[PDB]
Design a protein around this ligand. Structure first.
Ligand SMILES: [Mn+2]
Ligand SMILES: [Mn+2]
Ligand SMILES: [Mn+2]
Ligand SMILES: [Mn+2]
Lengths: 373, 373
RNA sequence: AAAA
């Protein structure tokens, strides 16, 4: 038997348990059992598994044990804890009461309070960790978690590249130098990307010689701006080799530049964020349900930020696009992540219509529009 | 001399406090003092205001009092309670520890436990209320809240219109008799409703005679089915009078029939639902942000149900429509309401594509499709 | 902060 046991209560929010266990283990540096006190409801949602997989401890140090209580029955939980610590003698007992129902938390606290060789902790959301007993004091959780740990703790599998077509020195100026004065030309390329033929050919080939393509395909686009001459012209404004155009170059022009700009700006200028915890164009998946997130990052307070980028949302069409994006962003973050997340919408346009502003305010979506970017 | 005082802890979920207070006031039916223990964070979110407005007790029965604690400081809540209750002579101190942080709840329990004039309660979500002290007892919270009380507890105003164009006997067969064989005709009327003129004329008036409209108004819709002859036909298949067409007759054909079917099915066949707590064609509003909800109801266990109706989601367009509807429904219910809500999508179509099925399952959206309707 |  190990000399130390870490007692945690399992509930919907896995992060307070992952954060505490990782912090305590790396302070303590000793073999231990981690006891997860769970329920039938939480085991159906695999919460104990998500906790274990986020921590990925080796078998040399850590033993796991999951026991089950009725989360709403204070006597059954008191009895289970009482019998457990009669049957198993530990020299150091560490209890995190942050998780569970209030019934589970109350039973644990009332059982462990004032006992010898016992320490009791509670983590308020967004604050320093507290020791409640035996010595009241606070501990800073600064930089404890990584982005991967946060996603693992939610049972979310993911894939990202952080591949950028242009570097930060270029994207810092691409709006002024290439985008702002060529908006009409860009609408053509947007049409080009959504055109039938061009989309299908890029499923089979990696690049395309734009000079070698027939003008019938450019007129089949149906757009005033989308001529063979203009597409060659805007491709060269952005520095691409018109003889070897791959799809990501088109996507860069049609709005990928703003995703890269936001991603690199965070990596280079946001003081409460480390580069290493920032991700661009992430695919997340859970229960075979897939979503694409433009930019996400974990800040140094271990809080997740999720950004949807919309380069421009001007017009009657841009307002419908913006409205749809507010719902989609809100649904994803409320459904895939726990409490400790902030959602943002970034755009170059200036948002002044009452409907998106009031919706974002009600939703808690932080809007960062042209006035600040 | 209030011989009874209720004490409640204020947190994000207002329903457990509103439900408990209404239940207890209805049980004892004597004047009482009601103490709210709140925090600066919850007052910023107006949570005690929502609780009191939902209950709208008369000054002649209830004295509301409010004291303030730190949500994360166990000794602060103990001290706040100690000072307020010192030397008290209440006959009955009724303590609801369901709300607050675990720190608040714990502090409250430890303060009131084992006292001679206290009773301590905890409400597990979706279960029987529990008395914890001095006896272990359970109570059913059946039919405690009204739909209006639930929405007031969230600070939400709403309007609705329960008038149905057709009765339940007609709506039980309208799909087979009128819809299934005229989908293309109805697609014409769907195009009619979106047309700028037809939408405009009905904003400046109420009644339109369809015989006196020029054909050029219909050809201007640009739908192969939206002729003058075809629309008159479908208006007659549903049994209306072409001289006096209201926007509601049109809305009935374009999908209102299915909303009415769902609404009437709830009122006529859902045994755990009181018809007075069901609402059709709802507009909810908070912070000047409005949402249209097809059908909502509070069931007899005080749980809110929110329904989006989509008559048909067949085809490429239908799946994009259905996808947008899932995000919109999820965004609204996760943002506007607390934990105690269930969201549903009702459709006549059969949903079997993997993407919507897995999205709905991850979101917890209950799909009632044609296999059940 | 009805299962940070
Ligand atoms: Mn985007
Ligand atoms: Mn004092
Ligand atoms: Mn029943
Ligand atoms: Mn609908």
């Amino acid at each position: 038997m190990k000399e130390t046991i870490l007692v945690n209560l399992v509930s919907e929010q896995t992060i307070p348990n992952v954060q505490f266990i990782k912090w305590y283990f790396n302070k303590k540096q000793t073999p231990m059992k981690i006891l997860l006190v769970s329920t039938k409801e939480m085991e159906q949602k695999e919460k104990s598994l998500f906790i274990k997989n986020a921590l990925h401890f080796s078998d040399s140090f850590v033993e796991w044990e999951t026991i089950h209580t009725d989360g709403n029955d204070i006597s059954k939980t008191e009895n289970i804890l009482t019998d457990y610590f009669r049957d198993n003698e530990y020299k150091n007992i560490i209890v995190n009461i942050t998780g569970g129902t209030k019934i589970m938390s109350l039973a644990a606290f009332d059982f462990f309070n004032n006992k010898p060789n016992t320490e009791i902790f509670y983590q308020p959301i967004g604050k320093e960790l507290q020791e409640l007993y035996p010595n009241k004091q606070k501990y800073d959780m600064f930089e404890v978690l990584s982005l991967k740990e946060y996603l693992d703790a939610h049972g979310i599998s993911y894939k990202y590249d952080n591949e950028c077509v242009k570097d930060w020195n270029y994207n810092k100026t691409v709006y002024d130098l290439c985008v702002a004065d060529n908006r009409e030309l860009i609408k053509g390329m947007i049409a080009l990307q959504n055109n039938s033929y061009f989309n299908n050919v890029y499923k089979r080939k990696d690049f395309l010689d734009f000079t070698q393509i027939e003008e019938e395909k450019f007129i089949a686009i149906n757009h005033p701006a989308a001529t063979k001459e203009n597409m060659i012209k805007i491709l060269q404004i952005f520095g691409f080799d018109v003889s070897r155009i791959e799809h990501k170059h088109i996507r860069y022009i049609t709005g990928g530049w703003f995703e890269e700009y936001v991603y690199q700006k965070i990596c280079n200028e946001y003081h409460n964020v480390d580069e290493k915890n920032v991700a661009l164009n992430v695919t997340i998946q859970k229960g075979n349900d897939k979503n694409e997130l433009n930019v996400i990052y974990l800040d140094k307070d271990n809080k997740l930020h999720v950004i949807e980028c919309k380069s421009f949302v001007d017009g009657n069409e841009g307002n419908r696009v913006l409205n749809d994006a507010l719902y989609k962003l809100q649904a994803i973050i409320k459904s895939k992540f726990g409490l400790y997340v902030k959602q943002h919408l970034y755009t170059k346009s200036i948002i002044e219509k009452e409907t998106p502003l009031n919706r974002a305010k009600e939703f808690g979506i932080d809007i960062k529009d042209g006035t600040q970017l």
